[PDB]
Design a protein around this nucleic acid. Structure first.
Ligand code: K
Ligand code: K
Ligand code: MG
Ligand code: MG
Ligand code: MG
Ligand code: MG
Ligand code: MG
Ligand code: MG
Ligand code: MG
Ligand code: MG
Ligand code: MG
Ligand code: MG
Ligand code: MG
Ligand code: MG
Ligand code: MG
Ligand code: MG
Ligand code: MG
Ligand code: MG
Ligand code: MG
Ligand code: MG
Ligand code: MG
Ligand code: MG
Ligand code: MG
Ligand code: MG
Ligand code: MG
Ligand code: MG
Ligand code: MG
Ligand code: MG
Ligand code: MG
Ligand code: MG
Ligand code: MG
Ligand code: MG
Ligand code: MG
Ligand code: MG
Ligand code: MG
Ligand code: MG
Ligand code: MG
Ligand code: MG
Ligand code: MG
Ligand code: MG
Ligand code: MG
Ligand code: MG
Ligand code: MG
Ligand code: MG
Ligand code: MG
Ligand code: NA
Ligand code: NA
Ligand code: NA
Ligand code: NA
Ligand code: NA
Lengths: 71, 182, 167, 260
RNA sequence: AGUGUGGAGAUCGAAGAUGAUUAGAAACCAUUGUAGUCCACACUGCAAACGAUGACACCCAUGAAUUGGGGAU
RNA sequence: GAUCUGGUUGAUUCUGCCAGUAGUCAUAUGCUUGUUUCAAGGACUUAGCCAUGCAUGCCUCAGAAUCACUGCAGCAGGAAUCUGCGCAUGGCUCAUUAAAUCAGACGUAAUCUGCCGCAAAAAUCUUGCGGCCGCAAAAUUGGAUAACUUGGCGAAACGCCAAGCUAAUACAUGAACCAACCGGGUGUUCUCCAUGAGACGCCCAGCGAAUGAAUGACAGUAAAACCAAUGCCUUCAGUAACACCCAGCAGUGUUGACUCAAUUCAUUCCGUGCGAAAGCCGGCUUCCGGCGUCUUUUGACGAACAACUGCCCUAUCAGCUGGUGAUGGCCGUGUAGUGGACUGCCAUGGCGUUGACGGGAGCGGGGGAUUAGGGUUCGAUUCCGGAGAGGGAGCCUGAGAAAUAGCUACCACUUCUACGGAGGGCAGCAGGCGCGCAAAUUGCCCAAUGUCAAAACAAAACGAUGAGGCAGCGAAAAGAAAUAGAGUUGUCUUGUCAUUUCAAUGGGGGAUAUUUAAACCCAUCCAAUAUCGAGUAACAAUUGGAGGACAAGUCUGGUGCCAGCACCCGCGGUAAUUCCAGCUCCAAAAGCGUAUAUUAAUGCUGUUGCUGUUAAAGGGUUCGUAGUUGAACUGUGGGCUGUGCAGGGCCCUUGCAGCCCGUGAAAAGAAACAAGAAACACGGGAGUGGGUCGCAUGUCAUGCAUGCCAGGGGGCGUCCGUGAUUUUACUGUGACUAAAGAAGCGUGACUAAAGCAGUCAUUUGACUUGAAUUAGAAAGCAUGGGAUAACAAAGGAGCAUUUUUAAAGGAUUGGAGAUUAUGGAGCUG
RNA sequence: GGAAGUCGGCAAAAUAGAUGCGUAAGUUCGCAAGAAGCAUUGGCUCUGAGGGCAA
């Protein structure tokens, strides 16, 4: 995913942009999801950076993933 | 009763969840022990699966480890002096995990004498010389031991296990809590 | 409730209820094959439509598609077995040319009539309904029984019938 | 917990007709998973025809006449899945529960001293108290001191009468395996390569006798011998060789014509 | 066209007045005339605001013209 | 079957709707109805209200029987009651419900888990006898309480007291020696050496749990010194370790990854864990079986939680959330467990025109209808998931419930009463009342399918089950199929006609019977010595129509813009093709009309695939942000032979072998090429360190062990460390994906709708019978391809040669750990 | 009991401070508004936050 916000302490918001296909019109739609991710102090990601994330146990009300690598 | 489910919470959009089921037994919570310092009193809680949690209402003895010497001793708790959640819990003498307590130091002194022959059979004296070769007690510890109270950190959960066990504070952590207590 | 026995329809009505040419053709088929109602012709129509739809779907495929090799073989086998198609023609395209009289010719009523056991298709109908006809010694009372080519030589009067060996 | 099993929801390989009844015997917990088992009542009633109904099946089973892996089993809901040896001494029949090439359960007849052996696939390895290594098999057996070379995925050839390990068939390239799940269940092939995808399902690439290539998840392969020529277990008639559908239809038609 | 505040106020001219015409004539016609019509500043945002024909881009036959800029003689 | 027709005009060509038409397991209603098969069936409105009855119990050889119970002569049955298990399943319904639920696909290393499978178990000072000791050994443990008896209370209550008895596998208690291995701590205890070493004494050292401290490996440098201790040969080569009684009784758990598995040390459980049930029954005093139960463990059956992509309409819903949790952090608490789930404290977050928030209609799928294709639509309802039991909320027990034929309370209704009190929950089955357009019997049965359970069947001795099955009612719907077949004379080659002859057959009536749990249906038959029945075959077919659409009368009476018809156009005002009737004819036919929905018809919702000058419809004009869309280019591979209606030595096909496959630069190496590559390095790396009956080591040893291609160089497998980086999308394969349903193979259930069966053999069984195959959006998993595209980066002046040798400077063997230094490999100039 | 008194709620009763939450029609957009309403405040013993000077 791409980093969307770094406003939180040790947590970032990422975006997963993708195309969704509508069968009836044989065409695609732009869609996005947003995931809250825990970011370790071992990384310093910025807005627009690409990140690999991995699923973990629930860490808060929304956090279900961990930053594993910053491209 | 008390529930741990997420249904009552607002969605992240701020909207209200429209609940369409009654609350379940499998998501219950229970009232906290609020364990205080005093003569022992524990109440079993029948938990899911038929297992028993031990809910401690009052505790005054704990099994406390001196990690550097890799030993432990059953000692009387004298006062709870620091709590990171709120100093209201220090005032109520509440025993929760990671709260700082003062434990009776005399047993650690007596073990120190038995294991090193120092007060703060030839074969045992051979052993005493075999030890002490790379051993130097800390000043911050031995000073506390002389006055008969050591600062320790509770490592168990009195609300779950019914025990106020712990470990003696040493090193930078001990300095941290000593600074915060002055 | 909790009953899983299947059932389906076997016929469909014509889209146009009054076409003079269709009505005349159907009345002809009724008179010549001795049918009771238009539902029998329409049942043959549904059978033919299903077979033809299958053949079109199969012919659209490349010739060596495994589905074509399997189902084309099966449908040719069935058409040859029941006498709908002549055994000479063996391509998948000849099912598309099947007509209603081709299926109607293989009814037990028409077969009994053509075999001389009956003076007419109307005689054949009542002969079949009255248990006087057996196919391989099995009494067949259904005039719409489609006769296989192999069973054509075993159609005689029933043993229990007074026209066979019965009282 | 569910005590019932609707007949429509029951596994298709049990060959229970949708019109015979609403229910099927729900397999109890035991040696095998209920989606991968054949209940004893199903065996004794539908497969062997020794019992005409469930009442006669209970009469036969509650007497201890049917043995699974040398022990009498009195429960019609006992799972009794793959590689199990079923013996009814009073009638003398004895067989191993296997998968045929179509993937259905097959009752492969056995000789004595063949019914004393069963193959068990190691699914987990753990240390028990006292530092005792224990191998857990696909059959739910917990073997208390396996061969020190035992790995997860290997096969243990096991003497059920003596309750002793006999030999170990390691999971390596060129070994003969049988597929125990998926679309290829029942096919016998050779391990040509096993690609590892950590955190995912490892894929085993196989090759049967006729050179047809196929794959499946590594969890679905069961080592049964060193080679397709020398198997450590007898296999059903088709020998795990999948036959062409057109060929099958043609041969069945010709054989039926020959019968008439 | 209409609105507000200042200005302007020749002409024409909704309202209105008077005279005709007419069965009646609140109309058309005649003579007038307020608001308007004009300007500054601020509003209003509607027209058969039309080519009743959205914008950008490509191909596309013939003759005589026309507006602006270039080139040749 | 990729289909249209009637109505706008005096006529025409359009646009366009209205009407027609076909289907619906799609409902109702009307008329009609002989036979048979297969089936829906109080969902829609009122998750409205309910009389009565039934719906969940379980015992055998194997828990407890002194019934004052029965039979027999102690045996055998055994009411009752205690005990163990179940009652959290099944059945019903669809009210709630849109980051919920659900589908496919994943996780739980974040957890609980009775019944079932396979396993494990060495803690424990007991008992009886003489005076705490001694002796001894198959442990002969203890108090209760039901049923029963006595007295009874109460109107009643699936309401109750109090005294006597007496059991359990209920409850409580409790087992020393036999009996092992291993470790830690210790005596001012003895030997013996010069600080070792060994004995003996005692304190502990079981499973599980808690805290603490260690293990839970290594794996990119080859060598020789010194001090100390300790191993060795003799008086530094080899060498797993280990200061004896086991000279190999773990130097090596698992994963993708773990603070997990397991082990050692210390301290603590214990006031809420751990019997050999101090148990039962069988065979042969002796052994040997079958059960039953406590604790530990893991895998099976589950449970709970999390969420990758998808999921109606509405902006005349634009901001939503954050006192008092909203988004995140820290230490806690609570939970089985994660977690703002919750306390305290901090920081301002989080979501939204890619539609948040709010409002409306809906349980979600599997699937159904219709369909050339693309689509449209339905899905209360059989399978799967969820939810609820009048409404709400609490809870106990239990492995599992926030249970409702469990409890508690309130709100509505509501039943009995002696007025003191006591009760109730059909959205289980049947059946009422209401509501409605709208939906069956207060039936039989556990024979089948299953569930529970102390339980095979049977023998004095038959478990319960409205779950389920069976029948009744039932023109929802579906399949098959009667209402006649042959004639003769004449009448008028046929064909109608009045006859007057034959046969045939069911509907129906029955049965030696068959079926079925018993019945009923289906089949079989109308002698097998011995069995009924058609001629108006009265055993009598209907429902709508006859101007057009649209098949069928320019018939005859009646009515006279009335009555009426007519879906639309229209007909009827005295010669009605249209009304009311007779006749005749037409269509479908045991069915056929009507109403309302819905699909096609409809290219009248248009992605495929509409229209916008004048028919409805381009915004008055620009600017402009999300959005959509967006120009080229990095790129002809070459030689050789043969072969082709190639064509005007060349190009072009087909096909086999060559290429460093542009130039350059040569067995090795250099250029491109590689992350699936390269450079290193790991026996705890590879079925022994991979493909390429004798000898030797040692022999106090199950040393019963080990080697008997060396060596070089290459090719590999595994695992780790260091080094340039390329995705997505599309497309091809492959894997993973309940049945029922849809396609489909085979198969004469008489056919068919079906079903998954059956078929064949002079006969105790073959067919080692069959039950093929597919498709089933999207997302997800692995991998081949690189043409069209997308994402990201850059904006070309922050854009920077390979080696050789030399000097100058600043981890490994060495006997193994330690220590302590040389000596290097490895850094700049 | 609660305006039945009286011409008429005259008179009297009533409301009340502070703090948090909350607040309609209408509107010249300023208000209406202290609209209406709901809640809390004592005493003790503590805890937290909010500063200035110098080396
Ligand atoms: K229930
Ligand atoms: K019925
Ligand atoms: Mg104006
Ligand atoms: Mg003027
Ligand atoms: Mg004027
Ligand atoms: Mg005029
Ligand atoms: Mg004028
Ligand atoms: Mg007209
Ligand atoms: Mg005219
Ligand atoms: Mg119902
Ligand atoms: Mg209802
Ligand atoms: Mg008994
Ligand atoms: Mg249920
Ligand atoms: Mg019902
Ligand atoms: Mg464990
Ligand atoms: Mg939060
Ligand atoms: Mg609803
Ligand atoms: Mg449904
Ligand atoms: Mg359901
Ligand atoms: Mg419930
Ligand atoms: Mg109700
Ligand atoms: Mg309840
Ligand atoms: Mg009930
Ligand atoms: Mg009384
Ligand atoms: Mg209630
Ligand atoms: Mg009822
Ligand atoms: Mg209902
Ligand atoms: Mg009912
Ligand atoms: Mg009805
Ligand atoms: Mg029922
Ligand atoms: Mg007339
Ligand atoms: Mg007339
Ligand atoms: Mg007329
Ligand atoms: Mg149009
Ligand atoms: Mg227009
Ligand atoms: Mg137009
Ligand atoms: Mg227009
Ligand atoms: Mg405008
Ligand atoms: Mg622009
Ligand atoms: Mg008054
Ligand atoms: Mg008065
Ligand atoms: Mg006053
Ligand atoms: Mg307002
Ligand atoms: Mg006011
Ligand atoms: Mg106020
Ligand atoms: Na114009
Ligand atoms: Na024990
Ligand atoms: Na927490
Ligand atoms: Na008429
Ligand atoms: Na009529």
């Amino acid at each position: 995913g791409v980093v969307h916000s770094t406003k939180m302490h040790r947590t970032i918001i990422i975006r997963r942009n993708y195309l969704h296909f509508i069968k009836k019109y044989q065409r695609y739609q732009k869609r996005h999801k947003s995931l809250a991710v825990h970011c370790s102090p071992a990384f310093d990601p910025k807005q627009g950076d690409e990140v690999v994330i991995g699923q973990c146990r629930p860490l808060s009300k929304t956090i279900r993933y961990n930053v594993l690598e910053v491209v | 009763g008390i529930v741990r489910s997420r249904l009552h919470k607002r969605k992240i959009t701020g909207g209200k969840t429209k609940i369409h089921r009654k609350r379940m037994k499998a998501e219950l919570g229970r009232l906290p022990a609020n364990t205080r310092l005093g003569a022992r009193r524990v109440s079993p809680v029948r938990a899911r699966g038929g297992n028993f949690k031990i809910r401690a209402l009052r505790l005054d003895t704990g099994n406390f480890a001196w990690a550097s010497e890799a030993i432990a001793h059953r000692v009387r708790l004298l006062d709870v002096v620091y709590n990171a959640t709120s100093n209201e819990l220090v005032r109520t003498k509440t025993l929760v995990k990671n709260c700082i307590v003062a434990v009776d130091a005399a047993p650690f002194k007596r073990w120190y004498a038995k294991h090193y022959g120092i007060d703060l059979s030839p074969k045992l004296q051979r052993e005493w010389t075999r030890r002490r070769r790379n051993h130097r007690v800390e000043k911050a510890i031995a000073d506390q031991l002389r006055e008969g109270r050591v600062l320790a950190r509770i490592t168990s959960r009195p609300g779950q296990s019914g025990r106020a066990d712990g470990i003696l504070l040493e090193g930078a952590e001990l300095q941290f809590y000593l600074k915060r207590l002055e | 409730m909790r009953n899983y026995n299947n059932f389906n329809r076997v016929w469909k009505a014509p889209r146009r209820p009054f076409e003079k040419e269709r009505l005349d053709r159907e009345m002809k088929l009724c008179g010549q094959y001795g049918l009771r109602c238009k539902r029998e012709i329409w049942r043959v129509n549904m059978t033919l439509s299903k077979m033809r739809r299958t053949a079109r779907l199969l012919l659209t495929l490349p010739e060596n598609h495994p589905r074509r090799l399997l189902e084309g073989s099966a449908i040719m086998r069935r058409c040859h077995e029941y006498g709908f198609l002549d055994e000479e023609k063996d391509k998948l395209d000849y099912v598309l040319s099947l007509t209603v009289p081709d299926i109607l010719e293989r009814r037990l009523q028409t077969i009994v009539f053509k075999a001389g056991l009956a003076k007419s298709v109307h005689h054949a109908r009542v002969l079949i309904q009255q248990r006087h006809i057996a196919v391989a010694k099995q009494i067949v009372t259904i005039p719409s029984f489609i006769v296989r080519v192999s069973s054509e030589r075993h159609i005689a009067f029933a043993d229990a019938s007074p026209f066979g060996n019965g009282r | 917990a569910k005590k019932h099993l609707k007949r429509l929801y029951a596994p298709k390989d049990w060959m229970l007709s949708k019109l015979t009844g609403v229910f099927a015997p729900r397999p109890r917990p035991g040696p095998h998973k209920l989606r991968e088992c054949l209940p004893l009542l199903v065996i004794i009633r539908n497969r062997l025809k020794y019992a005409l109904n469930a009442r006669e099946g209970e009469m036969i089973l509650r007497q201890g006449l049917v043995h699974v892996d040398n022990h009498p089993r009195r429960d019609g809901k006992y799972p009794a899945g793959f590689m199990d040896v079923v013996e009814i001494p009073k009638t003398g029949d004895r067989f191993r529960l296997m998968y045929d090439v179509k993937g259905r359960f097959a009752l492969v007849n056995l000789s004595e001293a063949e019914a004393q052996i069963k193959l068990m696939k190691v699914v987990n390895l753990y240390t028990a108290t006292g530092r005792v290594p224990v191998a857990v098999t696909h059959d739910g057996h917990r073997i208390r001191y396996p061969d020190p070379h035992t790995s997860i995925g290997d096969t243990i050839v096991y003497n059920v009468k003596e309750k002793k390990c006999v030999d170990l068939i390691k999971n390596r390239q060129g070994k003969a395996v049988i597929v125990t799940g998926g679309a290829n269940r029942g096919r016998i092939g050779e391990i040509v390569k096993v690609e590892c995808h950590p955190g995912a399902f490892n894929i085993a690439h196989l090759k049967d006798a006729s050179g047809a290539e196929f794959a499946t998840r590594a969890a679905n392969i069961f080592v049964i011998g060193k080679d397709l020529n020398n198997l450590q277990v007898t296999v059903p008639k088709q020998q795990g060789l999948r036959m062409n559908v057109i060929q099958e239809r043609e041969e069945r038609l010709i054989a039926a014509e020959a019968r008439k």
